[PDB]
Amino acid sequence: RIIYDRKFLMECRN
Amino acid sequence: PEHYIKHPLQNRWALWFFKNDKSKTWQANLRLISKFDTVEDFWALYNHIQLSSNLMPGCDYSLFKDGIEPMWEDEKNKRGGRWLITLNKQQRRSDLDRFWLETLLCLIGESFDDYSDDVCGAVVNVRAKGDKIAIWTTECENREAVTHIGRVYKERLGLPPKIVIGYQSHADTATTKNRFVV
Ligand SMILES: C[n+]1cn([C@@H]2O[C@H](CNc3c(O)c(=O)c3=O)[C@@H](O)[C@H]2O)c2nc(N)[nH]c(=O)c21
Structure with missing residues (x-):
């Protein structure tokens, strides 16, 4: 299972 | 490696x-x-x-x-x-x-731990008399699963303990009272 944090998902907006 | 690859999701999501x-x-x-x-x-x-x-x-x-x-x-x-x-x-x-x-x-x-396989999806209802956001699960009989999803769901959105969010089965929705509330 692949888990992504909220902090990490926000940084991929660019 | 890890320089040219897209970070893959656990599941494929349809909008x-x-x-x-x-x-x-x-x-x-x-x-x-x-x-x-x-x-x-x-x-x-x-x-x-x-x-x-x-x-x-x-x-x-x-x-x-x-x-x-x-x-x-x-x-x-x-x-x-x-x-x-x-x-x-x-x-x-x-x-x-x-x-x-x-x-x-x-x-x-x-982020729902092991109970992410029970999570089906979400829906937001843009309405003139209210707005509604919801998360759908695969079974209402799994109290161990449903309560943990909604509790993390409330902590991630950051609602005060004053507001209690409701959980209701679609059998009641299609015909209302809550089964679990946090
Ligand atoms: C998600 N959903 C809401 N409805 C109907 O929408 C009517 C009013 N609009 C809505 C609700 O109530 C919702 O939730 C929503 O959207 C209700 O009486 C539901 O019976 C639905 N009817 C079918 N056949 N299938 C659905 O998936 C469905």
């Missing part, structure tokens, strides 16, 4: 758009927009579509796992409940756009 039309059925008014299985393709699709607040009243965004359609009729959506968030008139400004985006990240990031 749906619903627009009410009295001339046709409910299922025909729900239409699909795209599918994605990476973090990059999620932001690519989301950054060009409208915010939930800007939508015309009577329209729904629906993100679900690939294979589950946004309707009680689906196998996984049968039986399974709904963690319902009612929003008032003024909440349209900032709370609606922020709660729905926070809901999307809880789905695709699978």
Whole structure:
């Protein structure tokens, strides 16, 4: 299972 | 390696758009927009579509796992409940756009621990008399699963302990009282 944090998902907006 | 690859998601997610039309059925008014299985393709699709607040009243965004359609009729959506968030008139400004985006990240990031396999999807209802955001599960009989999803769901959105969010099965919704509330 692949888990992504909220902090990490926000940084991929660019 | 790790320089050119897209960060892949656990599940493939399909985004749906619903627009009410009295001339046709409910299922025909729900239409699909795209599918994605990476973090990059999620932001690519989301950054060009409208915010939930800007939508015309009577329209729904629906993100679900690939294979589950946004309707009680689906196998996984049968039986399974709904963690319902009612929003008032003024909440349209900032709370609606922020709660729905926070809901999307809880789905695709699978932050619900082991109980992310029970999570079917989410839906936001842009309505003129209220706004509604919801998370759908695959079974309401799993109290161990349902309570843990809604409790993390409330902590991630950051609601005060004063507001209690309701969970209701689609068998009651299609015919209301809550089964579990946090
Ligand atoms: C998600 N959903 C809401 N409805 C109907 O919409 C009517 C009013 N509009 C809505 C609700 O109620 C919702 O939730 C929603 O959206 C209700 O009486 C529901 O019976 C539905 N009817 C079919 N056949 N299939 C659905 O998936 C469905």
